[PDB]
Amino acid sequence: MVNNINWVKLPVILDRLLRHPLLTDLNLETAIQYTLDFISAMGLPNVYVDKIETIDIKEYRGELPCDLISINQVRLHKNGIALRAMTDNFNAYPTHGEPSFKTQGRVIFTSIKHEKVDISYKAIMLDDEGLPLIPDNPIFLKTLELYIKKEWFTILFDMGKISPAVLNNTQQEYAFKAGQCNNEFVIPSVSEMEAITNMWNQLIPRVTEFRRGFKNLGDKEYIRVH
Amino acid sequence: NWGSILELDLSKVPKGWDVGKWMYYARVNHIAVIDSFKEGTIGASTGKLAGALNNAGKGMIETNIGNYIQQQINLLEFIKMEMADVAGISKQREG
Amino acid sequence: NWGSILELDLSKVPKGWDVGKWMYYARVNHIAVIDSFKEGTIGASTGKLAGALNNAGKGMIETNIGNYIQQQINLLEFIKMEMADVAGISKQREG
């Protein structure tokens, strides 16, 4: 992403929506739900807060943080070796290898009995109130505005309180701004293209940056001169 | 002269994936998972935007500099041959 | 005689990117990230402008000067051969 994620409070979107006379029954309560829906539907990883938090494994099981949404990595605390996805169907079940993990709810199922594991996860940036905090990018703001307007107009169209042409226009505009917002947050910046370039050109390919925390992924590959 | 350049659009890289790690696994496996049902493709899928956005392939900044280079090399061969002939010193007569 | 010339339109260089650094990384990686959902493409995507603006490839100022050069070289070979014959001095008889 080229631009920086400067955070602003949620009613910034209600400042802009309520300019429309047909959206004056919208509320913070509705904006919260539709904002969370938009955040998930776009799935942008720059909108989440990166956190690292250690936990203990009692026996092939560990308690997971409260605010976790998605895991970047899990690794062993003492070695630093990363874990992979668990493909085993009988992990801690005995009868009569490398470490891996599997997470469903508040519980992470590892293949290790008693160790500390480090989890690098993504959460939502919250407010002084326990509420979501949105980027102030006017592209993001316009796209979220258009998302909420599209949902409200879809309800009102299901009633027959909006013309089909009005909803068709709203859907067209939301679709274009959704694509544009997707490209805004995903296209790398200059530093991210230097990292991608140093990942791309290897005379000797590097294929083991998962073992580390992808630390050396964008490190330049130097060849000595002979 | 640089190689061909591909114009790559990242509108289908799956959600929650960095471009760097996506491309890294594409290198390793030669297979890149994409997401045709991203929110950014909603207009094209639902018919609100031009369908060329989910199609049309990837563009190329190709310049035909190889043909120019071949032409110059052939001209060099011709001129060296003609100098050899006018000097009265053939290629077979140098070696 | 100069090489082929490509007509490059920069309407899809991503936002906040200079043309120089964009082209520099395109050189290095042979891959140029573009942005199909730029504000300048809104008309073509939404159907308000001709769809050729998001399509049609890149044009070429190509001149067929190589064929002319080959014709002149062949004529030179023919004339030198004919002078050799009329003089009674064949190529095999010079070497």
Binding site: N168, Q172 | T46, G47, K48, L49, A50 | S45, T46, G47
Partner: peptide, 4 residues
């Protein structure tokens, strides 16, 4: 309608 949808033809853009």
């Amino acid at each position: 309608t949808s033809l853009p």
